[PDB]
Amino acid sequence: DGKDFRTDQPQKNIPFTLKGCGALDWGMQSRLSRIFNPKTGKTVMLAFDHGYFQGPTTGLERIDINIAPLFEHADVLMCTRGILRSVVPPATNRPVVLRASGANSILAELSNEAVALSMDDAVRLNSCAVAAQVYIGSEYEHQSIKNIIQLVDAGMKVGMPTMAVTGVGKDMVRDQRYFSLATRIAAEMGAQIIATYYVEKGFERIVAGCPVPIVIAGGKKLPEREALEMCWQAIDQGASGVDMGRNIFQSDHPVAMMKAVQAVVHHNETADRAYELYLSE
Amino acid sequence: DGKDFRTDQPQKNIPFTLKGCGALDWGMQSRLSRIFNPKTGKTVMLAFDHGYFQGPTTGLERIDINIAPLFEHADVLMCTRGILRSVVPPATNRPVVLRASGANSILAELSNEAVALSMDDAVRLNSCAVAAQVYIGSEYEHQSIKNIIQLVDAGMKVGMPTMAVTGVGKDMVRDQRYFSLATRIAAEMGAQIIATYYVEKGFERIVAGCPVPIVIAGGKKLPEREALEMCWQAIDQGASGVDMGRNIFQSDHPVAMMKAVQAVVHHNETADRAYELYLSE
Amino acid sequence: DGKDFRTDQPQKNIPFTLKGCGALDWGMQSRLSRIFNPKTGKTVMLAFDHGYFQGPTTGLERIDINIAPLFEHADVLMCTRGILRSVVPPATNRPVVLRASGANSILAELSNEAVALSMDDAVRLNSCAVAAQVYIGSEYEHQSIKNIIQLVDAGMKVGMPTMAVTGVGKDMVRDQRYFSLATRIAAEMGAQIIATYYVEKGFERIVAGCPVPIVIAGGKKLPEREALEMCWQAIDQGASGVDMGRNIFQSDHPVAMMKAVQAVVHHNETADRAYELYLSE
Amino acid sequence: DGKDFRTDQPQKNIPFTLKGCGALDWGMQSRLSRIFNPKTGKTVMLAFDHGYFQGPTTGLERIDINIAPLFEHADVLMCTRGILRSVVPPATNRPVVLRASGANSILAELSNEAVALSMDDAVRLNSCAVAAQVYIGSEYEHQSIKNIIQLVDAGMKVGMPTMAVTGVGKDMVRDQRYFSLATRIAAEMGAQIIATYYVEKGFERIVAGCPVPIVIAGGKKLPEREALEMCWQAIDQGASGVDMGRNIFQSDHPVAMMKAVQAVVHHNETADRAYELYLSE
Amino acid sequence: DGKDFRTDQPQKNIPFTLKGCGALDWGMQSRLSRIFNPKTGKTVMLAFDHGYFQGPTTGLERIDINIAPLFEHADVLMCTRGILRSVVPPATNRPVVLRASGANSILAELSNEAVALSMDDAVRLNSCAVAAQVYIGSEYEHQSIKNIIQLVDAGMKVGMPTMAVTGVGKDMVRDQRYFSLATRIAAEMGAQIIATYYVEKGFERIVAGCPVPIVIAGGKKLPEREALEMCWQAIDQGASGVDMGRNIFQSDHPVAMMKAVQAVVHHNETADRAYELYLSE
Ligand SMILES: CC(=O)[C@@H](O)C(=O)COP(=O)(O)O
Ligand SMILES: CC(=O)[C@@H](O)C(=O)COP(=O)(O)O
Ligand SMILES: CC(=O)[C@@H](O)C(=O)COP(=O)(O)O
Ligand SMILES: CC(=O)[C@@H](O)C(=O)COP(=O)(O)O
Ligand SMILES: CC(=O)[C@@H](O)C(=O)COP(=O)(O)O
Numbered sequence A, B, C, D, E: 001d002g003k004d005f006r007t008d009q010p011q012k013n014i015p016f017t018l019k020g021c022g023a024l025d026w027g028m029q030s031r032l033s034r035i036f037n038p039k040t041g042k043t044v045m046l047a048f049d050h051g052y053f054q055g056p057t058t059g060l061e062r063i064d065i066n067i068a069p070l071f072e073h074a075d076v077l078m079c080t081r082g083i084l085r086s087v088v089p090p091a092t093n094r095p096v097v098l099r100a101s102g103a104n105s106i107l108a109e110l111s112n113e114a115v116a117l118s119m120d121d122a123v124r125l126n127s128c129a130v131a132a133q134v135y136i137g138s139e140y141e142h143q144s145i146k147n148i149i150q151l152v153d154a155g156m157k158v159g160m161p162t163m164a165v166t167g168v169g170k171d172m173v174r175d176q177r178y179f180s181l182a183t184r185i186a187a188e189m190g191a192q193i194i195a196t197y198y199v200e201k202g203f204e205r206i207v208a209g210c211p212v213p214i215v216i217a218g219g220k221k222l223p224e225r226e227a228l229e230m231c232w233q234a235i236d237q238g239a240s241g242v243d244m245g246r247n248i249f250q251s252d253h254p255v256a257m258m259k260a261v262q263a264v265v266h267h268n269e270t271a272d273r274a275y276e277l278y279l280s281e
Helices: A026-035 A069-073 A081-087 A117-124 A141-154 A177-189 A203-208 A226-237 A255-263 B024-035 B064-069 B082-089 B119-124 B141-155 B176-189 B203-208 B226-237 B254-266 C027-037 C063-073 C081-087 C119-124 C141-156 C176-189 C203-208 C224-236 C254-266 D026-035 D063-073 D081-087 D119-124 D142-156 D176-189 D204-208 D224-236 D254-265 E024-034 E068-073 E081-087 E118-123 E141-156 E176-189 E203-210 E224-236 E252-265
Strands: A043-047 A076-079 A096-099 A129-135 A163-165 A193-196 A216-217 A241-243 B043-047 B076-080 B096-099 B131-132 B162-166 B191-198 B215-216 B241-243 C043-047 C076-079 C095-097 C127-133 C162-166 C193-198 C214-217 C242-243 D043-047 D075-079 D097-100 D129-134 D162-166 D193-196 D214-217 D241-244 E043-047 E076-080 E098-099 E131-132 E162-166 E193-196 E215-217 E241-244
Touching: A026 A129, A026 C095, A043 A255, A043 B131, A069 A255, A076 B082, A081 A096, A081 E193, A096 E098, A117 A141, A129 A141, A129 A177, A141 A163, A141 A177, A141 C119, A177 A193, A177 A203, A177 C081, A177 E176, A203 E024, A226 A255, A241 A255, A255 D026, B024 B131, B043 B215, B043 B254, B064 B254, B076 B082, B082 D176, B082 D204, B119 D142, B131 B141, B131 B176, B131 C127, B131 D224, B131 E081, B141 B162, B141 E118, B162 B176, B176 B191, B176 B203, B176 C076, B176 E081, B215 D176, B226 B254, B241 B254, C027 C127, C027 D176, C043 C063, C043 C254, C063 C081, C063 C254, C081 C095, C119 C141, C119 E076, C127 C141, C127 C176, C127 C193, C141 C162, C141 C176, C162 C176, C162 C214, C176 C193, C176 C203, C214 C224, C224 C242, C224 C254, C242 C254, D026 D129, D043 D063, D043 D254, D063 D081, D063 D254, D081 D097, D119 D142, D129 D142, D129 D176, D129 D193, D142 D162, D176 D204, D224 D241, D224 D254, D241 D254, E024 E131, E043 E068, E043 E215, E068 E252, E081 E098, E118 E141, E131 E141, E131 E176, E131 E193, E131 E203, E141 E162, E141 E176, E162 E176, E176 E193, E176 E203, E215 E224, E224 E241, E224 E252, E241 E252
Parallel strands: A043 A076, A043 A241, A076 A096, A096 A129, A129 A163, A163 A193, A193 A216, A216 A241, B043 B076, B043 B241, B076 B096, B096 B131, B131 B162, B162 B191, B191 B215, B215 B241, C043 C076, C043 C242, C076 C095, C095 C127, C127 C162, C162 C193, C193 C214, C214 C242, D043 D075, D043 D241, D075 D097, D097 D129, D129 D162, D162 D193, D193 D214, D214 D241, E043 E076, E043 E241, E076 E098, E098 E131, E131 E162, E162 E193, E193 E215, E215 E241
Antiparallel strands: none
16 A cells, blocks of 8 residues: 555656657567667678678688677677578677578679578577668669568568668669669668668768668778768768678778777767777777 | 758657557557547547347347447447447448457356457458457456467457456456456556556556556446546546447437547546536537 | 337348449458548548659658648558658558559669568558559560459458559550550459549540549649649549549648648539639648 | 440449348358348248257158258258268259257257368358357357357358357246347357247347347247248248248148248248148148 | 688687587577676576566556666566567667466466467567466466477477476475476476576575576565575576566665676675665665
């Protein structure tokens, strides 16, 4: 009778502010919190998935020795289930984003992708999301959009987020009007995280037209403090993070490279004080 | 070129303020919005499912004649699929909460209920929610809780809210500590709407202790002037609406009783000016 | 001794008058009534699914912003699940018609569409109908019908209506004899809603030849006084509503435009007395 | 061109007037229409399923010999799948209603019934409806209603009507208050046809309180001049037909009895005028 | 090339050290890493599912106010789906252990539990594990074990860990020989996490005899200095962590108390360098 139900204190719902994800089930919003830091709304994603069509890329020839010491320093790991089960220790304890597409290679057509793992297996490995390429304007574009749909159709049954990454190929003009077309279609079809390329004009425009968080692709490795201005620019006009690739594992200062990348995204750091985490390491 | 992405304007998630329902999928939140008014957060639910174990209850002998003109002034209709399909015209265009429990009758033990319709048919009939009686303290309580468990498990797959109605047994009172026990376990098991009966002391402690909306059922017929004080009291110390059966259709002016409960719930009306326009019609 | 079954007054079924929808289950008839007002039998549909193959179309760069305040003034909203969950709040409380086709784009063949979301997810989102493009006379005409067939097969299990939208090419003469070919087949295939374009000669024959309701596609952006004339005569020749977009959200006065569209549709307003209080607020 | 769409003539829906069945899918409305003649809205059903718990009951020892010549003068046959496949020839071309309950007998508890055939097989047998006993007030009242629930849930997936037969005990009074309770519970649960017994006072009130068609069970053999008054009284009080087992096949002039029953049910003839067409044969 | 395959340096599998979990799939091993900290192999679990059969016990009347600020201090949360979706924010970003048993209450038999959630929904809710009570020696012991058997069966398909919690009666004077029975059977049946009570004589034989990790349940409220002696004694004698419900939300220093529990489990902190992790507030 002296117990306190606090009748004086009205119940009020606590808002979920991750962009365009305010009308999702708890679990899907839960997995998204593992990727996107709840304080920050952004992520630093470590991609080491390129072997799914490229093979032993420079720096991913040995995942266990040169990429293993880098896991602890990533917000979220991105790889394949083959790489995950083989060389990525479960005890590493980081959110994982699975490559669920493949059946392409650098010797044949690049857009000829199919779903590379079932949602059944994405769940069994306790994934936070699945990722697939969308290839608008390429030969097998129809199929590429269909891969997303199947993952999204499957993803809703289980609360598993889908990442659509807009994949450019051969000779294709990277501009804002294309990626605006490309990112939006993926988001329009239902993808909840978008991975894209930074564009020097109108990146502000691809993010705005995209209702859901947007992440940056690294591109080819530049000298180790390079376009952290790219990251800084990306974060400054709305990118929700970076899914950096070779730009990290091929850096010759891999643990010290991302301590730099953290700062630009979460620490709202100037691009040129990213070098203040220096390569004198 | 002439496009306006309003880059000056960051995208913002709009909070869903309905109590304990801020982390549900769009469709489930959508279904809750037909029932729970999105700007007042409350409901006036018309229950006439009483015949599912009582037969032709008084006021309910002819649903097509005496209840048909009331569909139109109700927020939500509550009946069985048998009544819904037979005499409730689809063109009524009101949210329906289906009675999904039964296999008991006033001739036997009354807590002896089982699921009376599959989620398949609730979806087929475009239900906004499914409802079942839970009988805490009764001979057959275990099964009644099991019914909700099944309905919630089935309901989550499809975005269908589940309503639990606290059916009291064998005069075991019917005080606050009992309804706190009944409502919370039900809410704990996963039901997003809870129907309970009003008590004259401490109804505020039942509402506060329940993580999801609580609406009260009308009970046996009272003088309409004694019955809107119940509504006024329930809503004022936190009820998120009403599920009023017999205090509507047993009255001499159900349509005028209608508006009066409506006046109390949504319009924050004091008790007797709601009947000061009960007799105005 | 106190019951009144009013045996003198026989039960009489109340007819469902919606054209060609008199032999449907309650739930399917229920869903059609959120869309078609049961008193007028008509609809005003706000289409903002344009981005599903076009990207950030002019007027849809910010759905979150410029088209969102217009939701309240539409009878039914039409969009994608990607857009719906991201930027359309559940509290909007409007019937939704989901874009259920896609995998095409402005860079490739435009008739090459596949089903873009499962019936599983349409239910989960509490859709009122699903829509797909049919491309009669086009390269992927066959597949476009197959998608329709597939949607009807899934919809019938669950009581969900399918809307067929006529897909035009850069090749095709738009006349009465053609839309009669396009609309009839879709209706013949099982579609309960057909979306087509107005023709200035013989539109009365397109309406007559279709056993189910016909709604108008918006067509190219017009001066608003041209689009209410488009609206008035089609409804004058039997149309059951509009599936309008750019004549509303590209208008520089979107809210004032739909009230003008409601009046022409519903209130049998002549187009130039509809313009009366087009300039209200 | 010379086509006649006769656009001056709007399409108008033709109502399905069968009581409480105006909101059913076409196929379900189709099956109910084979049973209930749409011109009279009534039926004469020849029930010979008695062997499912009674064994070779009197008059039914030889279905192939003393019941076979009666099929043609019946509107719909009611039997079990065992009798149907074995001794009822397919070429009979009459509607059949399958007994879908059993597993009881005259040597044990008579309410102890379970579902006796899957919906898979009712369809396989081109059934127009499935039937089960409901045993209100009995030991297995719970089970008997659950049997109905399972059949109605299954029937809705397939457009198969379910008939509920008020299985009554007994030490228990056959008054209107009982059949009103039994019939209402069954109809409320979803059964589209209810078979019950005629009572000399307030049967019209059993009819009025049931939203869906009511057909009467024949009961034990009466003098045929007495059974035509039961028929006359029942139809006069709102009943939609007959479910006549023993008052037909136990008569020594069964064919002439069904014509006598036909006259009362469809052609609205008096009992004493239907009686001299009971003779004449 | 620019390749470095380190042929001199063979790949080596990283051993997974969690007790009895060296033969599990990555995903299952992954989920256990969110619960048992990879540094220590230990956990501090915050249980507040008590209401699933007790209703609003003291400290749990309002989860959102007095339990919400504690999310910050446990390794893993243990609760129900009803509490989770309603009052636990996804942005909490915490490992969750769902209550997967219920259908009991304090007014009836307490061992009368059933499986309370589909594995489907635990996955949808991104659980790290599901938990159920085992009631060895009680009247409904059989079902409680089957509940465990079923959850593991569902879990093994999906890589979802099952926790078995030992449910005691006041039949039993509870000692070491008995909890040895309860813990072992469950682990034997397949549960990978075990919850037990401390016994002051022979707790060493329960942990050694249990092949999979054991966490101790707090039990009823005791003074914090000896309750931290419970934590120290259990952890020091091989227990792998705590599943601490009532002994935290008992304190007038709940928030400052778990740091005392925190330190003892993770750092092998002395019980009474721990009584005063009060300080200044
Ligand atoms: C198939 C791909 O697109 C990968 O190459 C990838 O996305 C990794 O990131 P980056 O290193 O390309 O930026
Ligand atoms: C147990 C019941 O009676 C339910 O049918 C119910 O909750 C309807 O409410 P009311 O009729 O008591 O107002
Ligand atoms: C496939 C489409 O393009 C439809 O979205 C459509 O045509 C209706 O909107 P409007 O663009 O005609 O106004
Ligand atoms: C199994 C039955 O009892 C029903 O098939 C039935 O009611 C037959 O009619 P009657 O034998 O009562 O005339
Ligand atoms: C039977 C219970 O009460 C469980 O819920 C439990 O043991 C949780 O921890 P504590 O209450 O022992 O601290």
